[PDB]
Amino acid sequence: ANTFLEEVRKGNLERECVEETCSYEEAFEALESSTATDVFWAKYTACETARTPRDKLAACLEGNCAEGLGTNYRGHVNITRSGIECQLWRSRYPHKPEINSTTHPGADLQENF
Amino acid sequence: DRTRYFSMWNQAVDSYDPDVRIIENHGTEDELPNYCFPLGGIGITDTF
Ligand SMILES: [Ca+2]
Ligand SMILES: [Ca+2]
Ligand SMILES: [Ca+2]
Ligand SMILES: [Ca+2]
Ligand SMILES: [Ca+2]
Ligand SMILES: [Ca+2]
């Protein structure tokens, strides 16, 4: 955002929307891949507490750790705290989830992760 | 003569510039550009 003459130089997704509080416009401009754009947005949002420092935002981009209540987690662990198998979020077996893939598509709902 | 100036008697004729009363506007010579550069010589940069 700062260093006004940045909009004439080429840019770095990391030298605009990472090491600096950025516009989703410059984010949109730099991303275009609107799926990953939503991903980066989701990042930003969850990383709202990971805005600083820089390496914290880098880790929040890695996504292996759940931020706060766990909106950002994108790992491969699909097991409950006590070893019970996780039911498919979209499937109705054995429970029909009021809160499921249709209601939360932006969390990247995997098989049972 | 009157063009010469003598200080003692404060003798100095008053006259107008010839190019102010009658303008001879010939335009200006500007065939070439004229550019202002960046102090360092290279403005923007990258990383490699
Ligand atoms: Ca900037
Ligand atoms: Ca900017
Ligand atoms: Ca800067
Ligand atoms: Ca721009
Ligand atoms: Ca930019
Ligand atoms: Ca950097």
Swiss-Prot record, chain A:
Species name: Homo sapiens (Human)
Annotated glycosylation sites: 78, 100
Residues of the full protein shown: 44 to 156 of 622
Top-rank lineage group of the source organism: Eukaryota
Domain Kringle: 65-113
Residues found modified as 4-carboxyglutamate: 6-7, 14, 16, 19-20, 25-26, 29, 32
Stated name of the protein: Activation peptide fragment 1
Disulphide-bridged cysteine pairs: 17-22, 47-60
Domain Gla: 1-46
